[PDB]
Amino acid sequence: DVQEFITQMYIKQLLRHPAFQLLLAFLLLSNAITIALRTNSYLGQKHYELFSTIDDIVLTILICEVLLGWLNGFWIFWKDGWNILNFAIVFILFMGFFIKQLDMVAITYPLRVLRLVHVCMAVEPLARIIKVILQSMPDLANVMALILFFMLVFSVFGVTLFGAFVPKHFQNMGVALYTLFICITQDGWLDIYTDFQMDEREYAMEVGGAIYFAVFITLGAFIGLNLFVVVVTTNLEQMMKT
Amino acid sequence: PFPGHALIAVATSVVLGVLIFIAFVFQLRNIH
Amino acid sequence: LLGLQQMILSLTQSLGFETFIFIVVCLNTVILVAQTFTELEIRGEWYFMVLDSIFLSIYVLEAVLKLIALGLEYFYDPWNNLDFFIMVMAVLDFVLLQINSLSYSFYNHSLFRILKVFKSMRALRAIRVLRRLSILTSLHEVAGTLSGSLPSITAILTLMFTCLFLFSVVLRALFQDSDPKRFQNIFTTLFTLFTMLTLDDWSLIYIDNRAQGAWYIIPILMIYIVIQYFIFLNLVIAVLVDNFQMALLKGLEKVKLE
Amino acid sequence: TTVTTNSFLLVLGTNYDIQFEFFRTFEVSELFFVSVYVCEFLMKVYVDPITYWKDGYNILDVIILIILTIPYLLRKIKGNHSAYLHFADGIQSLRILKLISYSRGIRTLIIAVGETVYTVASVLTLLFLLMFVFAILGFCLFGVTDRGDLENWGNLASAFFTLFSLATVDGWTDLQEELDKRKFTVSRAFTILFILLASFIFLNMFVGVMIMHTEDSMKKFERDLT
Amino acid sequence: MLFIICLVFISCNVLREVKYQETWCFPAYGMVIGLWLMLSSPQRRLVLNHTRGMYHFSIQGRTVCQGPMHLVYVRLALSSDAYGGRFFQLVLCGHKLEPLVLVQLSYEQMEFLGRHLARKLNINYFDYLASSYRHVVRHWPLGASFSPGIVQRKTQVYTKS
Amino acid sequence: KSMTFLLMLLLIFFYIFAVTGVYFFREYSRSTIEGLEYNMFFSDLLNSLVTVFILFTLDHWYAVLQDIWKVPESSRVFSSIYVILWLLLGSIIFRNIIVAMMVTNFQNIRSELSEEM
Ligand SMILES: COCC(CCO[C@H]1CC[C@@]2(C)C(=CC[C@H]3[C@@H]4C[C@@H]5O[C@]6(CC[C@@H](C)CO6)[C@@H](C)[C@@H]5[C@@]4(C)CC[C@@H]32)C1)COC
Ligand SMILES: COCC(CCO[C@H]1CC[C@@]2(C)C(=CC[C@H]3[C@@H]4C[C@@H]5O[C@]6(CC[C@@H](C)CO6)[C@@H](C)[C@@H]5[C@@]4(C)CC[C@@H]32)C1)COC
């Protein structure tokens, strides 16, 4: 038993070592630059040989790192979240060699950039922002649930009013949800209301629709959508305190 | 031809991994 | 008056009367969410009217029995007050339907639909059901702090409406016949100012006025935007943040209490 | 007074009529002002060899003089009265910025505010990373396909702009509709989830971090004064 | 490590019969198969000869080594994590046996059978009489020869200030 | 009263961005393309200042930017940099500092009331 701790001591002093982290960051960053340049048909070819080489080098190194992590014990590697994230990315990348309907750019490029966040974590003036976001996420889930549960009721009422009248926005539940999400974002619902206004001759339901939009925008845009602010401040003060 | 990018990929990794292995042994002689 | 009303009570607050009514209300709301597709509402129109007359009779039962049971204490609680108003709307649209000819010109009459949405209000009773089963109170805390924040929210909200209303009055006074399409009427002045308060296409009305009328609207609109979006809405944000800060300090001291 | 008169003449310089009548006034005044600023810099570093670079405002002021010099040499030596002559000509819009070195209240404000720049730079880096990830998605899905919406997701120089117009929610529905007429099924989900992550959750986190950093700073200053 | 032999050999069988139907991709999962049987081979049985305070190591009926257990007590060394974690490693009498570390330490029943076993084996259970954090004093019987570590065993041990 | 000097920074920055947007967009205001929409916003100084306000409110920034691009002159690397730096600095940071300050002042008022209690 005496020996392998030193080998474990070696594994720690390598994997946690900062030169290694800096190299891996440099590789992933260069790969992201290659992805950005491949987003150009001309340069897609001229250096295709270089981009493909870098593409494979970074993947092999990622697999090596997952192997080192597993070398320390399957369970502790899986007693984390960042490790399972990196594993999911490298595994989805790996199956492209075998399967054929996954080795496509819409599934392989952006994952190599989601691989970059755990790299950026080592830059703790950055990491605290991510930690705040993650910690505050459940409160945002509760606020999201509030807003959706509010939106569904008004969607029902709006459909059962402006159905069979302006059916470009108010036929079924889904179209109404999308319309109310336009409104709660407060950009482009004036164009929507012009559809109420755009008629041959009408006065009774322009006022009703205006009342509807005004009440939704007051209670849900000025109060509900100004609650993410407050949740973030809540949690981030909690961290600053504890 | 195919066996010339997967091969370069494995080439660099092992070529790197040897230098990593160098330090592990080299450190043992230093402590001793 | 003491035995009859009392047995009406002990049957009313009974732990089966409530479940029976919540079953009714959840059925009514599943119908009411069925009716918002147009592929089912148009087919199953003849059964829905039957079911809704049935529900009207059931609500007659419940409302009359509860009133006889609990006097004006029934009018006292606002949960029921909602139900009583819903009841009144239901009976009114029932009698209006019977006093008209159920045809296309009444389907496309606005008042028929307006009376129909208040039926949608029955779905609100469903929250009472969700309360007993539980919402998990996952938003009990957010709701509680919103509850704490509201007294000042109402005050600042009415202050900014008042500012809206004064500016609307003066803008109607001044800028008629300079784009009458926007605010030829006092009500459309007021709506134009309210929709400016969300900052959507607000430059468009300046450009539209400048095209044919004149540009004096630019200092008015700039000052309007300053006051409302820049110093009022930020007050709502500030007071909400302070209220949740109090909630957090309460929680910290409470958890240290144990 | 030198800086204030320079700003006033700069304001009067955006009218070709007044730029024409009294042009000699403008020329003599501009040369007078550059002479004053350069003499101030030269003699104020004469009094002090090394510690002159300690002050931040000294660095700001030598930067101002650099910006003053650049378009002169561009126009005279290289000449060409090129496309970006009047750009750098109008960039001395910001040599009023020497006037900040005097009001003490603004200096204290600079302390209290600008001591929270690492948080700002952090959030801006994270926002850029998120926009990059989604620009790659938006290109791969609605871009290179050649059957859908080039020239709006055609390239990153356009993917970032459309994606920023979705961040600051101004006008996202026009892009969404012109991307929805092309029978893209997933586009609604893509834009909706981006509006969530980048507009609701992210900038409304910028505001939270700003609130508490400024609050802690301000309370520390108040306690110290008390 | 027969569980690994149990593990790999099963995987080979499910991989023994397959129809990849793919160009190249030679079905050479047999490189696993050797690794299966390799760890398979010899049961280990250790007996506590508390009558003379002895410990003799053997497996499948062939003695390997022996040593007295005059100073007997239970010790568990700390195996810290590179993350903010705490793991347990059990080293008894300063010797290198099969790790009896606390499984799923991060278990009350798991440590309960140990106290009975330490009572069954008639040695002290130091990590159990006070079981909150890293607190165990290794006995290290003078029969062992762990001098660079046996003396150093107390060095890692806290003397309670 | 607390955020008195912050408004003076904003006034300085309106000065900055307005009198440099007069110069950045001159070939755009001096343009002859038969079809344009926002050919006025940078005509004179007053129009430039109101334009800076409109950009400050994040209304039609992208539409104005594309209009600027519709002139074959006015390189898309200076108009873009100007607009984006005004939107980031002026429109998102500064609009957020105000909210931060007002929350701070509410916190203060709470503190004096609590101490007097
Ligand atoms: C008197 O003391 C009561 C107290 C227990 C208080 O429990 C509260 C829990 C939150 C809860 C259920 C309560 C009242 C308003 C409820 C809100 C009204 C809105 O309605 C909705 C749904 C219906 C829509 C039409 C409008 O929005 C929800 C989004 C909103 C709501 C249902 C969210 C949940 C709120 C009751 C115990 O004291 C001992
Ligand atoms: C948990 O126990 C709580 C209990 C006290 C319960 O008080 C209730 C009084 C009626 C009240 C205020 C309550 C909840 C829903 C409220 C309704 C939601 C709808 O919202 C509105 C306004 C907003 C519109 C968007 C929708 O319609 C109103 C028409 C409707 C409403 C405001 C009418 C009044 C209702 C709370 C005490 O128990 C000990």
Ligand SMILES: COCC(CCO[C@H]1CC[C@@]2(C)C(=CC[C@H]3[C@@H]4C[C@@H]5O[C@]6(CC[C@@H](C)CO6)[C@@H](C)[C@@H]5[C@@]4(C)CC[C@@H]32)C1)COC
């Ligand atoms: C446990 O007992 C508590 C009791 C005191 C209860 O006070 C209640 C007063 C009404 C109040 C503030 C409460 C809860 C839900 C609140 C509603 C949730 C909805 O949220 C909103 C705003 C946010 C939008 C996203 C959705 O709609 C409002 C329209 C709706 C709301 C804010 C109207 C006001 C309601 C708390 C004292 O008991 C001793």
Ligand code: NA
């Ligand atoms: Na807007």
Ligand code: NA
């Ligand atoms: Na808009």
